Amino acid sequence: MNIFEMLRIDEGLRLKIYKDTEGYYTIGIGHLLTKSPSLNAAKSELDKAIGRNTNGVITKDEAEKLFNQDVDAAVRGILRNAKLKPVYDSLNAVRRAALINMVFQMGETGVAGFTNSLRMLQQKRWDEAAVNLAKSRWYNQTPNRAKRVITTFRTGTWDAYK
Numbered sequence: 001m002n003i004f005e006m007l008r009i010d011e012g013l014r015l016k017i018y019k020d021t022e023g024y025y026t027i028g029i030g031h032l033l034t035k036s037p038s039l040n041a042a043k044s045e046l047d048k049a050i051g052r053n054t055n056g057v058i059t060k061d062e063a064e065k066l067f068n069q070d071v072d073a074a075v076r077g078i079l080r081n082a083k084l085k086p087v088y089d090s091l092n093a094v095r096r097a098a099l100i101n102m103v104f105q106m107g108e109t110g111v112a113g114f115t116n117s118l119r120m121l122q123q124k125r126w127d128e129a130a131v132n133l134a135k136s137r138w139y140n141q142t143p144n145r146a147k148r149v150i151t152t153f154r155t156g157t158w159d160a161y162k
């Protein structure tokens, strides 16, 4: 199990523009296109992102290409963030995956706002961090994904994904 397989499980794969749980236009493996309500403004961003006239549809290859960038972008934002980096360096490989997962779904800024949880993870207080992570809009909105991420932090294993 690795971050790519983990995220492919949490996000799924769609070759046509679709709306996320939050109602935003997305494509491929969890690639947010735009928060704008316009389907044309999504189709625009999509064509810009791919380099071609897609008419809202992409190939598997194109999807994995966006996935590689977003994962790379996710990790790099973590390493660039003063708040996130120290937490990441302090974690093992599995838990590192879990933090990358969060950043991919919610953005560096969003994750950076989980001040108390991060602090608890940095101090290795697993059970407590798990409780604090669940008191969030995040958990309430995507509860099954969130429990899986939370379990990963709590246990330090890939069980939630097996």
Ligand SMILES: [Cl-]
Pocket: 049
């Ligand atoms: Cl892009």
Ligand SMILES: [Cl-]
Pocket: 141, 142, 143, 144, 145, 146
């Ligand atoms: Cl969910």
